[PDB]
Design a protein around this ligand. Structure first.
Ligand SMILES: [Zn+2]
Lengths: 233, 137, 577
């Protein structure tokens, strides 16, 4: 942004990982995630991003997987989610985090990266658990898992501070669709003296065309007619 | 050695360590392994002699030190073994007998071996073939 | 026009070769993608015409130089290259004389037996498509194609390696339009790659006799030193399976010397010394492996690497990560009884895993291995057998402080099978407990054994009704892990009843563990010793005859280890009395 007519061409020097086939990508702290189309199998990767203020580099790829589950307009989408204790992502609450991803990611304090897929499948992967090499390929059946299949593609993933009583520790998980199934998720701990997840597949209007989150369980979304809000709080 | 080109490199390594020509170590180890050996005896030996043929093709075998070490053994050695050494062109029967100190001891040993052999030729025909062949040689 | 098209093909091939030899990590891939777009546009320009004979050997050399640079960059063949082959083949078919590649190839080679002067390009196209089918694992029809290229009367030659040896390249490749690689340079690669894969497959399927032949074939000829390493390593494995240790060592030495990447040799070394029982050197080798895995260019050409498959887990070439290994060391250290060594190793494991937020990710042992909480247990069992029990508690407490939010709320305690607690909790209460025995605290010991037992019976661990997360498949669900964990905490508590002199309560817990897991005998031992203290004969003999009537499948490690810890040496001696 320092950047040594008010139009500016980029020189191809500014190119890093010319992978060419990459459709999505997201960011954590010191870690970079892409997600790249190939043959049948789409592969998530995971590179370094040099923590010293150097020549702007990828590094060596740490790992790679195949989202075997997916076989192919709509780009798929990536969101990271770190748990409490540990940045442009989201933090959940320890109850939830443990609820969705399991002990491993809780114990590792491991960021977990959600990909939204044109299928409509909403897949998480634990990042710690993705470090491989030529000698050591990632098994997807192990390593990538699948929360809940909206039958329609994905537009926007977030999470929300219901019960609000910069780093806010959210208690509910948000998706959205094109045709407009939402799916918010929660921790209950109810009726059996045991933690259960609270699913809610609502049905909004229309084509949904983007989304966001504002303070206090208020999701600012858009249909073709109108900019409309939903409250969960 | 009881288990090819690898084994040659192994003896090269040992020789570089001890500052010995590879031939002496190869011969010594071969002779000691023959003493250890003494059917599948024959097959182990055949493979050992193929490897010794490789050693000799690469000039990594001192035949004279080999004869010397063989006459240091002199007790475990069967006649079959030394005939196979002869037939595989490893050592001539001539060079062997002209490298022992005690010529009388060689004579007595051969006497014993051949006296046992000419009884052994009356055990079975398949042994008697090999016996007759080496006896004629 | 074909002057210009050929000058363009030549220009882009020279660009690609300049990039392969020179440049940096960016400028390489930049010039490669430049040349790739060039070859794409030129292929579209050539495919626009209804092809003539003199345009055909240029189009096929461009098709091959396009697929080459495609798979070199992608680091893999795909089906787009198969369809490109199909396009160029229908273009050869429609010039002189549709359905699919096999009959298309048969007809095209019939047309090549009419001697159009492009067979230098046809053999190269066979090279690329054979390579595609090789990376796609389509070995059967590959034989059919190369069988059709050679005499059809050699149809009984089912073996691909003899058939590839007989397949000659056709010409010395006179001044045609320039190419990145020659057909014999591809043939050499095909040979070693096919031989290597057949040998590895034979190894994993338990024919390390047949494997030697195929692998020596990969060694003799075009073998980059990196592949030579992997060959020799596979030989290590084969000889090790046979029974021949010294030849095995020989190969591994060669692999180490030639290699800048000696993970896999030392792993075989480990498995080797494990076969002998050379425990000391085994642990020495694994310590070397750790340090080795501490330390860490792609040619625009088809090398062998491209065609090799990813190793399985059954292979000798799967080498985990530092973290995944250091776990090997400590686990294997801990079945021997080097608790002190074990302990160091484990803390260092755990240090790596949790403390890494800043550096590159060091990961957990994978989910064929144990789950991350099974690792905190292995840490604790090691620490107890050291006698570091104030540490075996800052373990069990750290663990349940992170995962509280998960643990069951145990209000079923008030409302008294239906609620759910996974075996690693009940187990953290087991080992929190035995740590208080070492410290000397009867009260809080019997507390923790009772708390373990309540979450074994007044919960079920197998409630996989709702797939609610990521979870432990194996280590935590086994009916084995249940019945033996019950027995463990029941005996653990029985010993504290014996210490207090309440041997009736001890008898109750021992009698229950007998009903629970009748194939421990540690249970029957403790029960029978108590009956021999109090009221021997009829009870004891009734259980004797039971034992002799009665007369380890997949037990998790921290539990196996715990049983071996508590069991008495003077066991069989007592049981034959
Ligand atoms: Zn487990």
């Amino acid at each position: 942004l320092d950047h040594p007519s008010p139009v500016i061409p980029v020189d191809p020097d500014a190119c890093i990982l010319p992978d060419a086939a990459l459709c999505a990508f997201t960011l954590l702290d010191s870690v970079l995630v892409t997600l790249v189309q190939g043959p049948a199998r789409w592969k998530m990767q995971l590179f370094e991003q040099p923590c010293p203020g150097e020549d702007p580099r990828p590094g060596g790829q740490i790992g790679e997987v195949e989202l075997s589950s997916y076989t192919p307009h709509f780009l798929p989408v990536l969101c990271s989610v770190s748990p409490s204790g540990s940045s442009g992502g989201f933090t959940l609450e320890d109850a939830l985090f443990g609820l969705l991803f399991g002990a491993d990611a809780t114990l590792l304090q491991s960021p977990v990266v959600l990909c939204g897929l044109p299928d409509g499948q909403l897949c998480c992967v634990i990042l710690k658990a993705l470090v491989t090499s030529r000698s050591a390929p990632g098994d997807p059946n192990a390593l990538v898992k699948i929360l809940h299949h909206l039958e329609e593609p994905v537009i926007f993933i977030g999470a929300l501070k219901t019960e609000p009583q910069e780093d806010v520790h959210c208690d509910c998980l948000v998706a959205f669709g094109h045709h407009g199934r939402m799916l918010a998720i929660k921790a209950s701990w109810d009726e059996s003296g045991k933690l259960v997840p609270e699913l809610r597949e609502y049905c909004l209007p229309g084509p949904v065309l983007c989304a966001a989150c504002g303070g206090g369980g208020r999701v600012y979304h858009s249909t073709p007619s109108d900019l409309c809000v939903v409250d969960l709080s | 050695l009881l288990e090819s080109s690898f084994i040659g490199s192994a003896l090269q390594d040992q020789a570089s360590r001890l500052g010995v020509p590879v031939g002496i170590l190869s011969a010594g180890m071969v002779a000691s392994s023959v003493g250890q050996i003494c059917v599948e005896q024959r097959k182990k030996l055949s493979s050992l002699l193929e490897f010794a043929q490789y050693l000799l093709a690469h000039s990594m075998f001192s035949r004279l030190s080999f004869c010397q070490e063989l006459w240091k053994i002199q007790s475990s050695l069967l006649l079959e073994a030394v005939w196979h050494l002869h037939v595989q062109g490893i050592v001539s029967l001539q060079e062997l007998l002209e490298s022992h100190p005690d010529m009388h001891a060689v004579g007595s040993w051969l006497f014993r071996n051949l006296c046992c052999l000419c009884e052994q030729m009356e055990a079975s025909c398949q042994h008697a073939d090999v016996a007759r062949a080496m006896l004629s040689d | 026009c074909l002057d210009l098209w050929r000058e363009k093909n030549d220009r882009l091939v020279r660009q690609a070769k300049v990039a392969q030899n020179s440049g940096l990590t960016l400028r390489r891939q930049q010039l490669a993608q430049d040349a790739l777009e060039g070859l794409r546009g030129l292929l579209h320009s050539l495919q626009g015409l209804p092809a003539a004979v003199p345009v055909l050997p240029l189009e096929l050399t461009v098709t091959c130089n396009f697929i080459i640079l495609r798979a070199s960059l992608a680091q893999g063949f795909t089906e787009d290259q198969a369809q490109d082959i199909q396009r160029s083949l229908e273009r050869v078919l429609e010039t002189q004389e549709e359905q699919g590649l096999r009959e298309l190839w048969d007809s095209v080679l019939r047309a090549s037996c009419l001697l159009p002067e492009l067979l230098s390009a046809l053999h190269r196209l066979v090279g690329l498509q054979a390579a595609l089918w090789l990376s796609a694992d389509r070995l059967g029809d590959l034989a059919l194609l190369l069988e059709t290229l050679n005499g059809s009367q050699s149809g009984a030659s089912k073996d691909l390696l003899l058939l590839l040896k007989t397949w000659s390249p056709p010409a010395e490749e006179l001044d045609a339009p320039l190419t990145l690689q020659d057909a014999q340079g591809l043939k050499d690669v095909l040979l070693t790659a096919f031989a290597y894969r057949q040998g590895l497959q034979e190894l994993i399927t338990g024919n390390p006799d047949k494997a030697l032949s195929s692998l020596h074939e990969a060694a003799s000829g075009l073998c980059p030193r990196p592949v030579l390493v992997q060959v020799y390593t596979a030989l290590g494995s084969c000889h090790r399976k046979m029974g021949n240790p010294q030849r095995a060592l020989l190969y591994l030495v060669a692999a180490l010397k030639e290699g800048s990447a000696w993970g896999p040799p030392l792993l075989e070394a480990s498995r080797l010394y494990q076969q002998l029982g050379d425990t000391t050197a085994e642990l020495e080798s694994l310590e070397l492996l750790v340090e080795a895995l501490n330390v860490p260019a792609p040619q625009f050409l088809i090398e062998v690497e491209l065609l090799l498959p990813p190793p399985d887990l059954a292979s000798p070439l799967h080498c985990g990560t530092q973290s995944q290994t250091k776990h090997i060391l400590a686990s294997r250290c801990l079945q021997t009884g080097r608790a002190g060594d074990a302990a160091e190793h484990y803390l260092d494991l755990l240090a790596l895993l949790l403390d890494s937020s800043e550096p590159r990710f060091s990961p957990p042992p994978s989910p064929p291995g144990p789950c991350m909480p099974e690792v905190f247990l292995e840490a604790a069992v090691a620490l107890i057998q050291a006698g570091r029990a104030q540490d075996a508690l800052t373990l069990c407490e750290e663990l349940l402080s992170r995962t509280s939010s998960l643990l069951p709320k145990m209000s079923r305690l008030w409302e008294d099978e239906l609620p759910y607690c996974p075996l690693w909790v009940s187990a953290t209460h087991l080992l929190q407990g035995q740590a208080w025995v070492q410290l000397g605290a009867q009260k809080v010991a019997i507390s923790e054994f009772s708390r373990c037992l309540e979450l074994l019976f007044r919960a079920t661990p197998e409630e996989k009704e709702q797939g609610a997360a990521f979870n432990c498949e194996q280590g935590c669900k086994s009916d084995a892990a249940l019945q033996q964990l019950r027995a463990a905490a029941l005996i653990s508590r029985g010993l504290e009843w014996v210490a207090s002199g309440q041997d009736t309560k001890a008898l109750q817990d021992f009698l229950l563990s007998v009903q629970m897991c009748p194939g421990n005998r540690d249970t029957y031992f403790h029960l029978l010793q108590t009956l021999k203290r109090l009221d021997r004969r009829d009870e004891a003999t009734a259980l004797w005859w039971r034992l002799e009537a009665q007369t380890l499948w997949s037990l998790p490690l921290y539990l196996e280890s715990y049983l071996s810890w508590i069991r008495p040496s003077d066991r069989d001696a007592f049981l034959e009395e």
